[PDB]
Amino acid sequence: GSSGSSGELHPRTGRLVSLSACGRTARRQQPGQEFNHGLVLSREPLRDGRVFTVRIDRKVNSWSGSIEIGVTALDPSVLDFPSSATGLKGGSWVVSGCSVLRDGRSVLEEYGQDLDQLGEGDRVGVERTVAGELRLWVNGRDCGVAATGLPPRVWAVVDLYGKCTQITVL
Template sequence: MVDKWAGSIEIGVTTHNPAYLQLPSTMTNLRSGTWMMTGNGVMHNGTTVLDEYGHNLDRLKAGDTVGVVRRDDGTLHFFVNGAPQGPAAWNVPPNVYAVVDLYGQAAQATIVDEGGGVRP
């Protein structure tokens, strides 16, 4: 974490295959197939769909954890420090790709799978 910028990490999922995606300056600018938690809101295709959702990501400290999961029923859920934040989206298609956007104060992230192993 660095303190000279506003905002923090953004996390979510996209239907876009990263091998073929031209990356925007921030994932919240994607206008299709993307759900992101940013601050304490949730965006779908670049538009805020939930305000005041969960723990504000802008208040995270170094060592805090965030997570996202798409459940079999098509709901999308976020987690902050292991605590579920509740459903954030519905009817999310299967086969989405995880997205972590280092934005604002977030300078580095480590991706860990649910089994606890670190992924390169």
């Protein structure tokens, strides 16, 4: 048994978004055209304390975009992959680089961890406290609290557009 995974990644994705046979590696296609055009969620709902970490396999410096990552309250089996992670609704928290949003609304800014700073050589992860507070983790370190008031069940959301292109779960 075993595997050495955490939250994994759902095999179902958009068009430009593609996953591996294992289901623990996400990547985008057509890097020389567009950025946002899909999404990648976890295979299973993150448990209390469980921190969904992910590394940046590849990062293109041709664009000026950023990487979006957070959590959602909608199952990936019946979720509607929006234009981007930040474009999620129905109780979904996303970080648009030093900016925490929920359902497409800014609530916190100047957050401790800055995803926009990432760029080949920096991993990031999310976590959902029992109380219902979304937190982030960089290189296995506490960054603080992004938002509060989360449901009892959530999933690890991740997006690969512009800067970010490929991601891998730890």
